Design a protein around this ligand. Structure first.
Ligand code: SAM
Length: 261
């Protein structure tokens, strides 16, 4: 409970985008919405803590924030305190959006497909609620190789050594499957890199992100197995990664794929 809420805030701090980057992304998303004269309303499926939503909410756009997770929405509610007059919070499943047909102008989806086996049901709901001329706005972060990549690969290796090998490349495969559906559905997906930057991260911060299972790929392992892997990984890092508090750069990019009805 308090534990679930802390994990939610932890997720928010780990995935936060630098202010300039948040701004670049929000501008690209707002530019893609074409409301013929109406006040544009955005719907985000899997809004989480509101990492993607706040930048837009802050600029005054009507926003419907949908998520199945109560703890994530509790953080979202606190994050938008004082700037929530045009926000509607919704606790529901993206496979059954409680909104009318043709009721929104843009539907935002960032880091959700890989968590939904029957994602085509979500895509169909997004299309159902989008108004003619509406846009599906998919976004995702990408990272280049760094010591964080080395740590994550070491985690994967240790997991396999414990007898629990983990799946690789689900987000990317899922993303391709969705593009296949978007083409087929006549939504003409257009992808563009909307932000590229380098941020600092220390070996210790990367280890803590793994410890707290803040990455979906670390969530499959039984918790005690992850606990054993983390003890191994902290010791390995202390022996092989030098000053655990020395920052290293991590180059990232954010891609936006816009499809239109
Ligand atoms: C990986 S997070 C990303 C949140 C936010 N979009 C961001 O980019 O920071 C995934 C979110 O989707 C939610 N979620 C997963 N499956 C869902 C579903 N079926 N319906 C609604 N929300 C779902 C999770 O609870 C979580 O908040």
């Amino acid at each position: 409970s308090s534990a679930l809420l802390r994990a939610a805030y932890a997720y928010d701090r780990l995935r936060a985008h630098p202010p300039e980057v948040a701004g670049q992304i929000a501008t690209a998303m707002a530019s893609a919405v074409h409301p013929k004269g109406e006040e544009p309303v955005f719907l985000e499926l899997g809004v989480g803590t509101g990492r993607i939503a706040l930048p837009l909410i802050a600029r005054g756009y009507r926003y419907i924030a949908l998520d199945a997770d109560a703890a994530m929405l509790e953080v979202f509610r606190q994050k938008i305190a004082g700037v929530d007059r045009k926000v509607q919070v919704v606790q529901a499943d993206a496979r059954a959006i409680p909104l009318p047909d043709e009721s929104v102008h843009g539907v935002i989806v960032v880091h959700l497909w890989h968590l939904v086996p029957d994602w085509p049901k979500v895509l169909a709901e997004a299309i159902r609620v989008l108004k003619p001329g509406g846009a599906l706005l998919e976004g995702w972060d990408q990272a280049e190789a760094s010591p964080e990549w080395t740590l994550q690969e070491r985690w994967r290796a240790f997991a396999a050594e414990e007898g629990f090998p983990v799946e690789r490349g689900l987000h990317a495969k899922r993303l391709k499957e969705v593009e296949e559906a978007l083409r087929r559905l006549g939504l003409k997906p257009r992808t563009r890199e909307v932000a590229r930057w380098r941020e600092e991260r220390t070996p210790r911060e990367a280890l803590e992100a793994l410890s707290e299972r803040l990455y979906s790929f670390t969530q499959g392992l039984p918790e005690p197995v992850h606990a054993r892997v983390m003890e191994r990984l902290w010791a390995w890092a202390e022996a092989e990664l030098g000053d655990l508090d020395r920052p290293f750069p991590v180059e990232k990019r954010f891609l936006l794929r816009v499809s239109r009805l």
